[PDB]
């Protein structure tokens, strides 16, 4: 880009480098993502361009999409910190429950919105949840997975995390439903509460087996059709399901109930974002402000 003074390199995304930049004309500060190449499928460009109309307060705004000289630039609204960095910074004391609740509530609203427009994220993780000083949290990179797919390694060869991946994806499902995002958010909810990743898998089978060890090896009883999935193996070990009281202490029964519904094995049974917003857990939701040192 020629009309963008690039303040700094913010990070490295799944698809490309991210810079903090200042638009010389509007003076606005944005997050500029630079992506890759055999001409780049125009099918992706159309899909991505449609995201410019997917506007919501809990969705990072996509300001522009520019395809030029073998590169694809995505211009996004800028937020000062991501949830991964905030959780690390809050590791010693933990994120207060009221803020955890507020963040989950807002993330579900963002999901409810995109899902109602038939757009899935598919690769939700702390790294793409951005926060500001106002107490808001927004989902970034929504819709990019439908356009580019989720690779095994990023453009820098970094391993794309499997920690938040729904079991139906790990088992080979061809079609992803909105339920995949609810699963990822549930894993993130648990991580905020316990200050440790729920299922820190370091391979696809380790990821699947960690899920099984906590939630029990799935069977036709809890997940009709699971034994017919592409990568299901009758030889998977059979682990017993653990009590959520042991999984996310010391979260209260309302939060444990909601998390259990977000982590149902059967995608068709997993709670929707819309239904989750009405869960008793959010009865006393508020909008606290985090302490951010920028
Ligand atoms: C998930 C990585 C891509 C995001 C796109 C939107 C976005 N907005 N701000 C940032 C940022 O990193 N600020 N420190 C990002 C990064």
Query: From the helix content, strand content and strand pairing, which structural class follows?
Result: alpha+beta
Number of strands: 8
Cα gyration radius (Å): 19 Å
**Helix count from the secondary structure assignment:** 10
Shape designation:
globular
Q: Sheet bearing the most strands, described?
A: 5 strands, antiparallel
Q: Ligands in the structure?
A: the ligand CCC[C@@H]1CCc2[nH]nc(C(=O)NN)c2C1
CATH class of the largest domain: Mainly Alpha
CATH A-level architecture of the largest domain = Orthogonal Bundle
**Strand coverage percent:** 15-25%
Gap between N and C termini: 27 Å
What descriptors fit this protein?
10 helices, transferase/transferase inhibitor, binds the ligand CCC[C@@H]1CCc2[nH]nc(C(=O)NN)c2C1, three-stranded antiparallel β-sheet, alpha+beta, Transferase(Phosphotransferase), domain 1, protein kinase, 8 strands, 294 residues, five-stranded antiparallel β-sheet, Phosphorylase Kinase, domain 1, 16% strand
Q: What this model shows, in words?
A:
The protein folds into two domains: 1-80, Phosphorylase Kinase, domain 1, CATH 3.30.200.20; 81-291, Orthogonal Bundle (Transferase(Phosphotransferase), domain 1), CATH 1.10.510.10. The chain contains ten helices and eight strands. The two termini are 27 Å apart. It is of the alpha+beta class and 294 residues long. It is globular and about 60 Å long. The chain has helices at 42-50, 83-89, 97-116, 144-148, 167-170, 179-194, 204-215, 244-247, 253-262, 273-277; strands at residues 4-12, 16-23, 29-35, 62-68, 71-77, 81-82, 129-131, 137-139. Helix content is 31%, strand content 16%. A hairpin with a 5-residue loop joins strand 7 (129-131) and strand 8. Helix 3 (97-116) runs antiparallel to helix 6 (179-194). The strands form two sheets. The protein has a five-stranded antiparallel β-sheet with strand order 1-2-3-5-4, with helices on one face. A three-stranded antiparallel β-sheet has the order 6-7-8. The ligand CCC[C@@H]1CCc2[nH]nc(C(=O)NN)c2C1 is lined by residues 10-11, 13, 18, 31, 60, 76, 78-80, 82, 127-128, 130, 140-141. Residues 10-11, 13, 18, 31, 60, 76, 78-80, 82, 127-128, 130, 140-141 line the site of ligand Z46.
């Amino acid at each position: 880009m020629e009309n963008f003074q690039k303040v700094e390199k913010i990070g490295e995304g799944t698809y490309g480098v991210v810079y903090k930049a200042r638009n010389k004309l509007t003076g606005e500060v944005v997050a500029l993502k630079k992506i890759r190449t055999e001409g780049v499928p125009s099918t992706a460009i159309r899909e991505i361009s449609l995201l410019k109309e997917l506007n919501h307060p809990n969705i990072v705004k996509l300001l522009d999409v520019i395809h030029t000289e073998n590169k694809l630039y995505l211009v996004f609204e800028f937020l000062h910190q991501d949830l991964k960095k905030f959780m690390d910074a809050s590791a010693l004391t933990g994120i207060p429950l009221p803020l955890i609740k507020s963040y989950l509530f807002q993330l579900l609203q963002g999901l409810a919105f995109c899902h109602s427009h038939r757009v899935l994220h598919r690769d939700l993780k702390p790294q793409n949840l951005l926060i500001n000083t106002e107490g808001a949290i927004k989902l970034a990179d929504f819709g990019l997975a439908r356009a580019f797919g989720v690779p095994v390694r990023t453009y820098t060869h970094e391993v794309v995390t499997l920690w938040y991946r729904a079991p139906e994806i790990l088992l080979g499902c061809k079609y992803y439903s909105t339920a995949v995002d609810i699963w990822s958010l549930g894993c993130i909810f648990a991580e905020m509460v316990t200050r440790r990743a729920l299922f820190p898998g370091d391979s696809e089978i380790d990821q699947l087996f960690r899920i099984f060890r906590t939630l029990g090896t799935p069977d036709e009883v809890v997940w009709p059709g699971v034994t017919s999935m592409p990568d299901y193996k009758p030889s998977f070990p059979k682990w017993a399901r653990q009590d959520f009281s042991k999984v996310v202490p010391p979260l209260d029964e309302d939060g444990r109930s909601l998390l259990s519904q977000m982590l149902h094995y059967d995608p068709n049974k997993r709670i929707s974002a819309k239904a989750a917003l009405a869960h008793p857990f959010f009865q006393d939701v508020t909008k606290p402000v985090p302490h951010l040192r920028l």
